[PDB]
Amino acid sequence: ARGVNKVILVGNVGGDPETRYMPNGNAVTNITLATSESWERTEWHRVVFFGRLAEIAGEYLRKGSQVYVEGSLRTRKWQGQDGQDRYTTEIVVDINGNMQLL
Amino acid sequence: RGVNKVILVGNVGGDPETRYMPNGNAVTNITLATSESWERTEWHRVVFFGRLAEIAGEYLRKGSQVYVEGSLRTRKWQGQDGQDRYTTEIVVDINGNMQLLG
Amino acid sequence: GVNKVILVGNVGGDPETRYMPNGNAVTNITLATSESWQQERTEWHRVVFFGRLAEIAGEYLRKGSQVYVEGSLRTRKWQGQDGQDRYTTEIVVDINGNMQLLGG
Amino acid sequence: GVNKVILVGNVGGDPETRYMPNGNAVTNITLATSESWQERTEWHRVVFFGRLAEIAGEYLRKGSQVYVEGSLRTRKWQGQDGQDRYTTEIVVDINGNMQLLGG
Ligand SMILES: O=c1c(O)c(-c2cc(O)c(O)c(O)c2)oc2cc(O)cc(O)c12
Numbered sequence A: 001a002r003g004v005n006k007v008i009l010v011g012n013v014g015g016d017p018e019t020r021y022m023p024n025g026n027a028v029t030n031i032t033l034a035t036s037e038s039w040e041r042t043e044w045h046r047v048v049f050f051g052r053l054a055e056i057a058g059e060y061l062r063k064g065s066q067v068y069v070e071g072s073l074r075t076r077k078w079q080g081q082d083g084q085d086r087y088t089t090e091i092v093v094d095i096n097g098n099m100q101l102l
Numbered sequence B: 001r002g003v004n005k006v007i008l009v010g011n012v013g014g015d016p017e018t019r020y021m022p023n024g025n026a027v028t029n030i031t032l033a034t035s036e037s038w039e040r041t042e043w044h045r046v047v048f049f050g051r052l053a054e055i056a057g058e059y060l061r062k063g064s065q066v067y068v069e070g071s072l073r074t075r076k077w078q079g080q081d082g083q084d085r086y087t088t089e090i091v092v093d094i095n096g097n098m099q100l101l102g
Numbered sequence C: 001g002v003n004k005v006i007l008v009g010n011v012g013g014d015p016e017t018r019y020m021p022n023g024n025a026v027t028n029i030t031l032a033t034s035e036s037w038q039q040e041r042t043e044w045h046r047v048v049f050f051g052r053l054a055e056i057a058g059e060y061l062r063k064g065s066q067v068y069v070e071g072s073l074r075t076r077k078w079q080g081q082d083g084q085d086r087y088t089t090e091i092v093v094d095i096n097g098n099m100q101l102l103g104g
Numbered sequence D: 001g002v003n004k005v006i007l008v009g010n011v012g013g014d015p016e017t018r019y020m021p022n023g024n025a026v027t028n029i030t031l032a033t034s035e036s037w038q039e040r041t042e043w044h045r046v047v048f049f050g051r052l053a054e055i056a057g058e059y060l061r062k063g064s065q066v067y068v069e070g071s072l073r074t075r076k077w078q079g080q081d082g083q084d085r086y087t088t089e090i091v092v093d094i095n096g097n098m099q100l101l102g103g
């Protein structure tokens, strides 16, 4: 009927956080997060924070910061300037998730 | 050198597609639906490797409820038009887990 | 830090739910998880729910129900009737956690 | 079923590592996680086996921050009987994971 959709990541922040405000005006910050698994492959994650965690992320995270993150997966549908249909899967960290500077 | 973990419980979207590579090894593919009701449903591309692939292929059907634990991998590809596209999947292999529910 | 527990298993007996003056509900179960490989070892967990999930658990869980549970670990200290220190570690599932009835 | 625990916190004292009749290492720590609402800290008994036991023993120290993923095992034991006692531990072995944090 309904399910579980949970993501946990520990890794290093790719560049400085980009935080912006909606009209509301609630904070949304964006980062990319690198995790690596060795047998080396590194994996880049698009993490987006909302609400209090957005402000905290925006304030405290920097390029190279190590951080723990817990959220859920959302794939957004969007259009390129040729029309078409593109998709991006992100890790949404909001009130139902968590973040910890490490 | 990071943590990259995904846990999902949801219902399988269509019958599993399983195929064999050279080497004699199974890879099965499903889509998995998770929903949070106040309703939004989220579709996940899950791909299994190794023993779990055979087990998935054999036991999962359209509508099956299943628990899944894997890690996120986004694959880059050029679409027929010149463009870069990305597909993020949940890889469930020896480091992950699956459990048929019901 | 982070303190997180995820369990899928079968409920051991009927839930025991009770209400405080407030009221607010608290329900208790035991939950069995097994790893098979001996031929199986089963592990018994003391899970306790608070708030909305407590009512939902109380209502919907029964002996034998399969359920998913996400909470955090709390270990309670107590003196037993021999005067000795005892400890009980529970999985607390509250507003920060989650529960999902499985099957149909 | 599924029996999974994930913790991030600070190690309570130096790790205690010991070796078994074979050669295999087992190391023990306590791990503190805290939530402020103004604060409650929770102490976890974590026990490592195999490679992670050696890595834990070598690299973890009092105050180290670490990520840990394991499963819950409650052990029965006598000790002094006295009486029989029970202790729930987080077992981190080949099916789990650990990551030293900080840099
Ligand atoms: O899984 C969940 C979860 O973890 C939290 C959460 C919230 C916090 O404010 C925390 O600090 C925290 O650690 C967890 O909320 C939730 C709320 C839901 O409606 C449903 C969920 O499934 C979760």
Ligand SMILES: O=c1c(O)c(-c2cc(O)c(O)c(O)c2)oc2cc(O)cc(O)c12
Residues within 6 Å of the ligand: B094, B095, B096, B097, D052, D093, D094, D095, D096, D097
């Ligand atoms: O999460 C897991 C994990 O880390 C390992 C693992 C850990 C090590 O330290 C190793 O050297 C290794 O080969 C595997 O096995 C697993 C096996 C499962 O069935 C399920 C899991 O979730 C894990």
